[PDB]
Amino acid sequence: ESYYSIGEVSKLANVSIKALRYYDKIDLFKPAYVDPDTSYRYYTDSQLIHLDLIKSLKYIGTPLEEMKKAQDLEMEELFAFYTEQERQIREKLDFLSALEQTISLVKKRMKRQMEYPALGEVFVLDEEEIRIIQTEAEGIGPENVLNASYSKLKKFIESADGFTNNSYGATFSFQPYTSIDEMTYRHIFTPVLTNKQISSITPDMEITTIPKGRYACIAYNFSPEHYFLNLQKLIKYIADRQLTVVSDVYELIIPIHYSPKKQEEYRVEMKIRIA
Amino acid sequence: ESYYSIGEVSKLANVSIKALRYYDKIDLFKPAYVDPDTSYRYYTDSQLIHLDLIKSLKYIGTPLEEMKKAQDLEMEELFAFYTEQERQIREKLDFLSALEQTISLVKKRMKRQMEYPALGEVFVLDEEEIRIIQTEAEGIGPENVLNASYSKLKKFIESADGFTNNSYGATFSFQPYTSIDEMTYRHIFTPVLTNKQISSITPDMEITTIPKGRYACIAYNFSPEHYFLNLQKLIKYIADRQLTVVSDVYELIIPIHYSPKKQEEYRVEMKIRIA
DNA sequence: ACCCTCCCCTTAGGGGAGGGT
DNA sequence: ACCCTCCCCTTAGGGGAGGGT
Numbered sequence: 001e002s003y004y005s006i007g008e009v010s011k012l013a014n015v016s017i018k019a020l021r022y023y024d025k026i027d028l029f030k031p032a033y034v035d036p037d038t039s040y041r042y043y044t045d046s047q048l049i050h051l052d053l054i055k056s057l058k059y060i061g062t063p064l065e066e067m068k069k070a071q072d073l074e075m076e077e078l079f080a081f082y083t084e085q086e087r088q089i090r091e092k093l094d095f096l097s098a099l100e101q102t103i104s105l106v107k108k109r110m111k112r113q114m115e116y117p118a119l120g121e122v123f124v125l126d127e128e129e130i131r132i133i134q135t136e137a138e139g140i141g142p143e144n145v146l147n148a149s150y151s152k153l154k155k156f157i158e159s160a161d162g163f164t165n166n167s168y169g170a171t172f173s174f175q176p177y178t179s180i181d182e183m184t185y186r187h188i189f190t191p192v193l194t195n196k197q198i199s200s201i202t203p204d205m206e207i208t209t210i211p212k213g214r215y216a217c218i219a220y221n222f223s224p225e226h227y228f229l230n231l232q233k234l235i236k237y238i239a240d241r242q243l244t245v246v247s248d249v250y251e252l253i254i255p256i257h258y259s260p261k262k263q264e265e266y267r268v269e270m271k272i273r274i275a
Numbered sequence: 276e277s278y279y280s281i282g283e284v285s286k287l288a289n290v291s292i293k294a295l296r297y298y299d300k301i302d303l304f305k306p307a308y309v310d311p312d313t314s315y316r317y318y319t320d321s322q323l324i325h326l327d328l329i330k331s332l333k334y335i336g337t338p339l340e341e342m343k344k345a346q347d348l349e350m351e352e353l354f355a356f357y358t359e360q361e362r363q364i365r366e367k368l369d370f371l372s373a374l375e376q377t378i379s380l381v382k383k384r385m386k387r388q389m390e391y392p393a394l395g396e397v398f399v400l401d402e403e404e405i406r407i408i409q410t411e412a413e414g415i416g417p418e419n420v421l422n423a424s425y426s427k428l429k430k431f432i433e434s435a436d437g438f439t440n441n442s443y444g445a446t447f448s449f450q451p452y453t454s455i456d457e458m459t460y461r462h463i464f465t466p467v468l469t470n471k472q473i474s475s476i477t478p479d480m481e482i483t484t485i486p487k488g489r490y491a492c493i494a495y496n497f498s499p500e501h502y503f504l505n506l507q508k509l510i511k512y513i514a515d516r517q518l519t520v521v522s523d524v525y526e527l528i529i530p531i532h533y534s535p536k537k538q539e540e541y542r543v544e545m546k547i548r549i550a
Numbered sequence: 551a552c553c554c555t556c557c558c559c560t561t562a563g564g565g566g567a568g569g570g571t
Numbered sequence: 572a573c574c575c576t577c578c579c580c581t582t583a584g585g586g587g588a589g590g591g592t
């Protein structure tokens with residue numbers, strides 16, 4: 001006849017008093033006997049074995065609440081249980097692994113923004129392909145455009161990436177605009193990350209890309225009086241070197257800070273493909 | 276000038292009112308203006324952009340609490356952040372993957388208990404190798420043995436597997452015992468699962484195995500009056516067919532139910548290797 | 551129809567006091 | 572020394588009422 005003080009138990013089955021104390025109250029693991037005089041908790045050498053399954057269970061991560069009926073069942077039962085437990089583990093797994101990738105996609109995209117060497121002048125390079133989706137921007141000028149203008153397409157991205165548009169886009173025609181009001185938005189995208197089956201795409205959105213062609217682009221930080229010049233100087237550029245234009249302009253925007261705390265600024269990126 | 280009702284916001288950035296309502300209270304995302312007459316919440320088309328990072332952040336799984344200083348930083352900052360976030364994801368990952376395996380080890384071991392075809396008689400087969408650890412059972416007889424007798428070795432297993440001893444063992448000498456008191460425990464193990472570096476092993480425990488040799492074993496459900504016969508009949512067996520003994524007996528125990536609710540019973544497994 | 555608030559639920563405990571063996 | 576209790580903390584909200592536009 002071996003009987004134990006709660007201490008002993010907690011020392012024996014590495015456990016916190018408060019833990020077991022509340023396991024008693026959880027009714028999962030009550031002591032073999034409470035001294036109705038001193039409210040003290042005493043357990044029997046028997047009991048301990050019960051502590052295994054819970055340790056286990058809690059290890060895996062199953063609410064004590066479930067651990068409740070968890071005990072009751074016998075082997076062929078618990079076995080299936082334990083497997084159900086694996087379909088679970090085996091689930092969250094590949095879920096996150098995704099993110100893992102997902103981010104590693106984002107990051108790269110991020111760094112490639114900082115890696116811009118010429119802030120303010122034309123950059124001309126070899127770019128990669130852009131899985132993106134847009135709608136046709138019915139009327140909206142760079143002066144019109146909002147965010148509420150994004151809803152749908154947004155609702156969509158997150159619905160197939162979990163991750164929202166960090167990047168914001170719209171395309172527009174290539175012309176020697178006199179003014180800003182001289183240009184009105186064509187299509188307005190969002191960059192897609194996942195290569196998963198984007199389905200349920202309501203036909204109002206098209207699903208395509210920015211090819212892996214040549215680009216003559218330039219970046220900066222938006223400023224009204226700014227934006228324009230930069231576009232101007234873009235125009236000049238091609239017009240000068242005379243290169244052959246092959247798409248529209250991809251002025252794409254991304255914020256630099258996300259702080260409510262202050263004045264929102266962001267980096268801009270008008271780019272044009274050419275051959 | 277576009278201004279929105281909380282509804283709109285919740286409809287626009289797929290979000291729950293209560294969510295944002297509490298984001299305001301969290302002070303993360305407060306409205307652009309609260310009607311000091313009607314306490315109504317109004318946001319600006321500006322704001323929304325702020326909602327991205329949080330959606331994102333909450334997506335990844337970062338307490339809003341952290342999301343707090345999360346915003347404030349600028350790119351080269353947030354970028355590193357986002358990576359720290361990946362060391363995290365990239366962490367929990369391989370952690371669980373482990374379990375995944377760990378269990379798939381257990382399960383198999385489990386099923387191999389149900390797959391016992393002859394409950395009550397001798398089974399003779401080709402077995403696999405057993406990474407296990409034990410101590411030398413100083414005196415303890417099958418009559419002595421407890422659980423408190425396990426502590427250490429137990430403390431250890433969980434400390435290197437997360438998972439506790441589902442299986443319980445002890446070895447003992449091979450002899451034609453007259454009685455139960457005629458046998459006293461030699462070594463008393465616990466089966467090790469992980470193939471990881473079990474270190475800090477205080478020299479009081481040895482780390483070895485049950486080989487992949489031949490076994491003449493039998494199982495059942497313990498019962499005092501029982502246990503004995505079964506051992507007896509084991510003895511008989513070898514003595515009869517005359518096979519050559521090569522180790523000690525591995526009577527190993529495992530419970531069948533873990534329910535506090537009732538009378539604890541368990542399946543037993545005296546096994547002997549022979550050539 | 552929308553919004554706003556106040557309230558009371560939802561895990562698994564942990565720290566810390568406050569008195570008693 | 573140990574135990575026991577009572578209490579008040581710890582996320583991210585969600586349902587539901589209760590009255591007001």
Ligand code: 118
Pocket residue numbers: 002003004033035042043
């Ligand atoms: C000899 C053996 C056990 C008890 Sb106890 C007990 C009493 C006071 C303080 C600690 C332990 C006991 C149990 C029920 C009724 C009266 C006394 C006792 C026995 C087994 C398990 C736990 C406690 C007393 C004498």
Ligand code: 118
Pocket residue numbers: 142143144145146147222227253264
């Ligand atoms: C009218 C319409 C949109 C913008 Sb703006 C903007 C707003 C604040 C600070 C900086 C820029 C904008 C317009 C053209 C090109 C780049 C930015 C704007 C951007 C995203 C979402 C909503 C408005 C500006 C005036």
Ligand code: 118
Pocket residue numbers: 277278279308310317318
């Ligand atoms: C024209 C444009 C805006 C407001 Sb309003 C407002 C008032 C009552 C109910 C809903 C909106 C406003 C704001 C501050 C002080 C007085 C009136 C308002 C404007 C921009 C953003 C949010 C609300 C009023 C008239």
Ligand code: 118
Pocket residue numbers: 417418419420421422497502528539
């Ligand atoms: C004295 C010492 C240990 C056991 Sb038992 C045991 C206890 C209750 C119900 C069934 C068995 C036991 C002894 C020899 C072989 C198999 C089981 C026993 C088992 C594990 C831990 C503590 C005691 C029995 C009497």
Ligand SMILES: [Zn+2]
Pocket residue numbers: 136186187
């Ligand atoms: Zn078009």
Ligand SMILES: [Zn+2]
Pocket residue numbers: 411461462
């Ligand atoms: Zn020895």
